[PDB]
C-alpha cells in the first residue's frame, strides 16, 4: 500500500500533467496522496492565475464575520458574529491596522506557538463565502471556475440527471481568521488555491482515523453533542495539536502559501489559521471514488447545520432513507 502512514504529500506537476485535471487526481492518489487527506499541489513555473492582483479592491465582502470564541487556548468554539459590509480595500486596511496586524514573529512554527496561545482572547474578522472567481477566463489549466460538476459526475457514475450548480467561493482572511474542525458536505473533495497575500496553515486527520476525531470532539464539547449526532457539520469546534497529540489522534499539519494549490479528499477533516491579509478560492469537486463516500456520509439534521441547494439531490439520491429526516432539518 502507498503512503501507509498518512503523510501529507507534495506534488510538482509539469506544464503537460498540468493540463488533465481529472488524471492528475487520480495519479495523486495511485501515489497514496488520499490516505492523509491533504496534499499541496506546486503548479509548473509555466502556470499563472491571472496577470495581476491590482485590480480587486471594489469586490464587497457584503457579510463579514466576527469569529468570537469561547472555551480554553487548545479546546473552543467560535461563533460568527455579521459586521457591516466593506469592499476588499477596506478589509485590507483592517486587517494591516496595529489592532488586528500579524505580529512580530521568527517563522511559521513561531507564529504557530502565538496563534494556538493567544487566539481566544482575540476575535479577527473573516470574509466568507464569497460567490465568485479570480481566475483569467483564458487560464485553461487548474480553472476552479471551469472543473467539471459534481451533478455531471454523479450522472455520469450512476446515470442519474439532478438539479444543482456548483460554483467556487472567495475567502478574504486576516491573521488569526480561523476553519474550524470539518469534513466537506457530503465528504467531498475541495480543492483550494491561495491567491494572494500571506500563508495559511492547515492541519488535517487521515480519513481512515476520522472517527477518532470525532470520539474525542464528542468528549470535548458534550453539550453540542448531545443537541446533535453530527455537530461537527456545524463548523465552529477547534482542538489544537498540543491537544490532540495528547490524546493520541493521528494528525499532520503543513503550511499552505501565494501560489499553491491544497486538495481535501474525502472524509479528511481538516482546521486552520491564516497568517495575515490573503485571499483563497475553493470549490468543492467529485471523482468516481467519491460516490461510497457520499452513501456514507453523516449528516446534521438539528437545523443548524444549513447548507446549500444543491446538496438536496445528493441526499435524495444517495441516502433516500435519510433524506426526509435531513429536509425536516433544512426547514
Ligand atoms: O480557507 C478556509 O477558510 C477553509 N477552506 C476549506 O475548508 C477548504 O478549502 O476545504
Ligand atoms: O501526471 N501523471 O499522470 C503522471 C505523472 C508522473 C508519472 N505518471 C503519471 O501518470
Ligand atoms: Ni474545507
Ligand atoms: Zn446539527
Known sequence: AQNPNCNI??????????????????????????????????????????????????????????????????????????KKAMTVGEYRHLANSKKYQTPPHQNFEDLERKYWKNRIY???????????????????????????????????????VIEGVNTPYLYFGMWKTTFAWHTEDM???????????????WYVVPPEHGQRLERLARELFPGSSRGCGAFLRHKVALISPTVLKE????????????????????????????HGFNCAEAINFATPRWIDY??????????????????????????????????????
Not at 456514507?296 to 432513507?321: H, K, Y
Open 9 to 82: 504529500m507534495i506534488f510538482h506537476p509539469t506544464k503537460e500533467e498540468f493540463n488533465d485535471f481529472d488524471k492528475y487526481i487520480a495519479y495523486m492518489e495511485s501515489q497514496g496522496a488520499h490516505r492523509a487527506g491533504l496534499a499541496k499541489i506546486i503548479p509548473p513555473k509555466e502556470w499563472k492565475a491571472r496577470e495581476t492582483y491590482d485590480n480587486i479592491s471594489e469586490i464587497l465582502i457584503a457579510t463579514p464575520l466576527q469569529q468570537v470564541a469561547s472555551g480554553r487556548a487548545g479546546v473552543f468554539t467560535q461563533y460568527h458574529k455579521k
Open 122 to 160: 482575540n476575535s479577527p474578522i473573516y470574509g466568507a463565502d464569497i460567490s465568485g472567481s479570480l481566475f483569467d477566463e483564458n487560464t485553461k489549466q487548474w480553472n476552479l471556475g471551469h472543473l467539471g460538476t459534481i451533478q455531471d459526475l454523479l450522472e455520469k457514475e450512476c446515470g442519474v
Open 187 to 201: 465528504d467531498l473533495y475541495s480543492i483550494n488555491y491561495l491567491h494572494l497575500g500571506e500563508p495559511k496553515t
Open 247 to 274: 490524546n493520541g489522534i493521528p494528525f499532520n499539519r503543513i503550511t499552505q502559501e501565494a501560489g499553491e494549490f491544497m486538495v481535501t479528499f474525502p472524509y479528511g477533516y481538516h482546521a486552520g489559521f491564516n
Open 294 to 331: 457520499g452513501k456514507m456520509a453523516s449528516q446534521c439534521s438539528c437545523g443548524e447545520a444549513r447548507v446549500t441547494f444543491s446538496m438536496d439531490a445528493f441526499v435524495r439520491i444517495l441516502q433516500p432513507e435519510r433524506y426526509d429526516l435531513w429536509k425536516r432539518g433544512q426547514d
